[PDB]
């Protein structure tokens, strides 16, 4: 159930083949889908999380 809630919230589908420092997937949601593909190696945890949450609209 958890994995599904994460999709419901984020609308991100991950690429499961790439290594863990490669954040790769597709972001769907209300707007046209866009790819995610970046090396998280030299980024802090908080900045990475802020970046991924920036994809999720808050308008309502």
């Amino acid at each position: 159930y958890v994995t599904q809630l994460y999709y419901k919230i984020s609308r991100i589908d991950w690429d499961y083949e790439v290594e863990p420092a490669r954040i790769k997937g597709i972001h769907y949601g209300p707007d046209i889908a866009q790819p995610i593909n970046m090396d998280s190696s030299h980024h802090s945890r908080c900045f990475i999380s802020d970046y991924l949450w920036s994809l999720v609209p808050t308008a309502w």
């Binding site: 994995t3 994460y6 919230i9 908080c46 990475i48 802020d50 609209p57």
Partner: protein, 103 residues
């Protein structure tokens, strides 16, 4: 089916780490949403709320630690819009604002 179950585990773990959001099942059919990566100076510091579904199928926030001045209105809004994604995203944003104010 081994591939599918494995992928589901992997997805949960990647999401938890990347989003800084852990979702925990507790008593009385409730879920705790634990946000970390909120306070840039203490990335493991947790900000959490607890969610239930009431007898009419409505979202009900049963706890929020630390408290948020806006979360009761966010509950109203999720009941009106049924936009669960926006509900969670707005809560996360509110915790970030709060952490900034807490300093």
């Amino acid at each position: 089916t081994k591939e599918r179950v494995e992928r589901l585990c992997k997805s949960k773990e990647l999401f938890e780490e990347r989003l800084g959001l852990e979702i925990r099942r507790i008593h009385n059919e409730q879920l705790q949403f634990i946000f970390r990566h909120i306070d840039h100076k203490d990335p493991d510091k947790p900000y959490m709320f607890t969610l239930s579904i009431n007898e009419q199928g409505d979202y009900e926030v049963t706890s929020c630690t630390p408290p948020l001045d806006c979360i009761s209105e966010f509950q109203l809004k999720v009941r009106e819009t049924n936009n669960f994604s926006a509900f969670i995203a707005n809560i996360r944003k509110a915790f970030t604002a709060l952490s900034f104010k807490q300093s």
